[PDB]
Short mmCIF file of all heavy atoms in Angstrom, two decimals:
data_model
loop_
_atom_site.label_atom_id
_atom_site.label_comp_id
_atom_site.label_asym_id
_atom_site.label_seq_id
_atom_site.Cartn_x
_atom_site.Cartn_y
_atom_site.Cartn_z
N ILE A 373 16.56 -12.57 28.94
CA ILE A 373 16.54 -11.87 27.63
C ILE A 373 15.08 -11.40 27.43
O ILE A 373 14.16 -12.17 27.67
CB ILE A 373 16.98 -12.79 26.45
CG1 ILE A 373 18.35 -13.44 26.76
CG2 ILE A 373 17.03 -12.01 25.15
CD1 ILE A 373 18.65 -14.65 25.79
N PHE A 374 14.95 -10.13 27.00
CA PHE A 374 13.55 -9.57 26.87
C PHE A 374 12.93 -10.12 25.57
O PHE A 374 13.47 -9.85 24.60
CB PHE A 374 13.52 -8.04 26.90
CG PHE A 374 14.21 -7.51 28.14
CD1 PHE A 374 15.03 -6.48 27.98
CD2 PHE A 374 13.92 -7.93 29.42
CE1 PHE A 374 15.59 -5.84 29.08
CE2 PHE A 374 14.48 -7.33 30.48
CZ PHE A 374 15.36 -6.25 30.38
N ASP A 375 11.86 -10.87 25.71
CA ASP A 375 11.02 -11.29 24.57
C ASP A 375 10.58 -10.07 23.83
O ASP A 375 10.71 -10.02 22.61
CB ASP A 375 9.91 -12.27 24.97
CG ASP A 375 10.42 -13.65 25.28
OD1 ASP A 375 11.48 -14.02 24.68
OD2 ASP A 375 9.92 -14.33 26.29
N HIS A 376 10.06 -9.08 24.61
CA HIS A 376 9.47 -7.83 23.99
C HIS A 376 10.02 -6.62 24.73
O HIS A 376 9.99 -6.63 25.97
CB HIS A 376 7.96 -7.93 23.98
CG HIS A 376 7.35 -9.15 23.26
ND1 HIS A 376 7.10 -10.25 23.95
CD2 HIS A 376 7.18 -9.32 21.92
CE1 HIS A 376 6.63 -11.13 23.09
NE2 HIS A 376 6.67 -10.64 21.83
N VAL A 377 10.34 -5.48 24.01
CA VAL A 377 10.70 -4.21 24.62
C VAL A 377 9.82 -3.14 23.99
O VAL A 377 9.93 -2.98 22.81
CB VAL A 377 12.19 -3.90 24.45
CG1 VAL A 377 12.48 -2.46 24.94
CG2 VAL A 377 13.06 -4.93 25.17
N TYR A 378 9.04 -2.42 24.79
CA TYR A 378 8.15 -1.37 24.25
C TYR A 378 8.91 -0.13 24.13
O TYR A 378 9.05 0.61 25.08
CB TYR A 378 6.84 -1.28 25.17
CG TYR A 378 5.89 -2.34 25.00
CD1 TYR A 378 6.21 -3.72 25.42
CD2 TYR A 378 4.62 -2.17 24.46
CE1 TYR A 378 5.27 -4.74 25.33
CE2 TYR A 378 3.70 -3.25 24.27
CZ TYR A 378 4.02 -4.53 24.74
OH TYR A 378 3.15 -5.57 24.65
N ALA A 379 9.47 0.02 22.94
CA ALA A 379 10.45 1.13 22.57
C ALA A 379 9.92 2.55 22.91
O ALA A 379 8.86 2.83 22.27
CB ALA A 379 10.91 0.98 21.13
N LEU A 380 10.62 3.34 23.69
CA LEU A 380 10.34 4.71 24.17
C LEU A 380 8.99 4.70 24.95
O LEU A 380 8.44 5.74 25.26
CB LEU A 380 10.36 5.68 22.92
CG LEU A 380 11.67 5.81 22.24
CD1 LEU A 380 11.62 6.84 21.06
CD2 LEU A 380 12.85 6.20 23.14
N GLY A 381 8.51 3.50 25.31
CA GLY A 381 7.28 3.30 26.09
C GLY A 381 6.04 3.48 25.29
O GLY A 381 4.99 3.62 25.84
N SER A 382 6.22 3.55 23.88
CA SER A 382 5.06 3.35 23.00
C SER A 382 4.34 1.98 23.23
O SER A 382 5.01 0.90 23.24
CB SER A 382 5.44 3.42 21.57
OG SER A 382 4.27 3.36 20.75
N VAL A 383 2.98 2.12 23.41
CA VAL A 383 2.17 0.95 23.63
C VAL A 383 1.29 0.69 22.31
O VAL A 383 0.61 -0.29 22.25
CB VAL A 383 1.38 1.28 24.95
CG1 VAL A 383 -0.12 0.92 24.91
CG2 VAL A 383 2.00 0.57 26.15
N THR A 384 1.41 1.60 21.36
CA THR A 384 0.67 1.57 20.10
C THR A 384 1.61 1.08 18.87
O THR A 384 1.06 0.44 18.01
CB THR A 384 -0.02 2.89 19.81
OG1 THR A 384 0.77 4.03 20.16
CG2 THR A 384 -1.30 3.02 20.56
N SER A 385 2.92 1.36 18.89
CA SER A 385 3.85 0.75 17.89
C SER A 385 4.29 -0.64 18.39
O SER A 385 4.29 -0.92 19.58
CB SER A 385 5.06 1.61 17.78
OG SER A 385 4.80 2.97 17.31
N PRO A 386 4.52 -1.53 17.38
CA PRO A 386 4.90 -2.90 17.70
C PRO A 386 6.14 -2.99 18.62
O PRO A 386 7.13 -2.25 18.39
CB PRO A 386 5.29 -3.58 16.33
CG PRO A 386 4.81 -2.61 15.27
CD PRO A 386 4.49 -1.25 15.99
N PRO A 387 6.13 -3.79 19.67
CA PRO A 387 7.34 -4.03 20.45
C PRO A 387 8.49 -4.71 19.71
O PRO A 387 8.26 -5.46 18.80
CB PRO A 387 6.84 -4.81 21.67
CG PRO A 387 5.46 -5.35 21.26
CD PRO A 387 4.93 -4.50 20.09
N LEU A 388 9.78 -4.32 20.07
CA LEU A 388 11.01 -4.92 19.55
C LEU A 388 11.20 -6.29 20.18
O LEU A 388 10.70 -6.48 21.33
CB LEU A 388 12.17 -4.08 19.74
CG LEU A 388 12.16 -2.65 19.21
CD1 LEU A 388 13.42 -1.86 19.58
CD2 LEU A 388 12.06 -2.61 17.68
N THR A 389 11.94 -7.19 19.58
CA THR A 389 11.98 -8.67 19.94
C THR A 389 13.41 -9.12 20.20
O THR A 389 14.32 -8.79 19.38
CB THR A 389 11.25 -9.51 18.86
OG1 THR A 389 11.68 -9.19 17.62
CG2 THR A 389 9.71 -9.29 18.97
N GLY A 390 13.61 -9.91 21.26
CA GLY A 390 14.89 -10.55 21.57
C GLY A 390 16.00 -9.48 21.85
O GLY A 390 16.86 -9.33 21.00
N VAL A 391 15.85 -8.77 22.97
CA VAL A 391 16.65 -7.65 23.33
C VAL A 391 17.22 -7.88 24.75
O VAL A 391 16.45 -8.25 25.65
CB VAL A 391 15.86 -6.30 23.32
CG1 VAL A 391 16.58 -5.14 23.94
CG2 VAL A 391 15.50 -5.95 21.89
N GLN A 392 18.60 -7.66 24.90
CA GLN A 392 19.33 -7.95 26.17
C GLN A 392 19.20 -6.73 27.09
O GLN A 392 19.13 -7.03 28.35
CB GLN A 392 20.86 -8.15 25.91
CG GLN A 392 21.51 -6.92 25.28
CD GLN A 392 22.76 -7.39 24.54
OE1 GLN A 392 23.72 -7.95 25.09
NE2 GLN A 392 22.68 -7.19 23.17
N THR A 393 19.24 -5.58 26.62
CA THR A 393 19.50 -4.27 27.46
C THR A 393 18.84 -3.12 26.73
O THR A 393 19.11 -3.00 25.45
CB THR A 393 20.97 -4.10 27.69
OG1 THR A 393 21.54 -5.18 28.33
CG2 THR A 393 21.25 -2.84 28.41
N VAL A 394 18.13 -2.32 27.45
CA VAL A 394 17.36 -1.07 26.84
C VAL A 394 17.71 0.19 27.64
O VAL A 394 17.47 0.20 28.91
CB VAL A 394 15.85 -1.33 26.85
CG1 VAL A 394 15.37 -2.02 28.04
CG2 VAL A 394 15.12 -0.07 26.55
N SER A 395 18.14 1.25 26.97
CA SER A 395 18.22 2.62 27.38
C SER A 395 16.86 3.24 27.74
O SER A 395 16.03 3.34 26.81
CB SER A 395 18.92 3.53 26.42
OG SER A 395 20.31 3.24 26.37
N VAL A 396 16.77 3.71 28.97
CA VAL A 396 15.55 4.44 29.49
C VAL A 396 15.98 5.77 30.06
O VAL A 396 16.70 5.78 31.02
CB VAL A 396 14.76 3.58 30.57
CG1 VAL A 396 13.41 4.25 30.93
CG2 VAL A 396 14.54 2.21 30.14
#
């Protein structure tokens, strides 16, 4: 399970937490 997901690859916005699966 992903502890952190850097949404849309933003490295400046806070990462999302406790995520199974992410659309890239």
Side-chain angles (χ1 to χ4, degrees):
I373 309 164
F374 303 135
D375 287 326
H376 304 96
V377 173
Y378 285 69
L380 298 181
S382 180
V383 136
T384 41
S385 299
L388 302 176
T389 51
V391 169
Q392 62 207 296
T393 301
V394 43
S395 287
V396 187

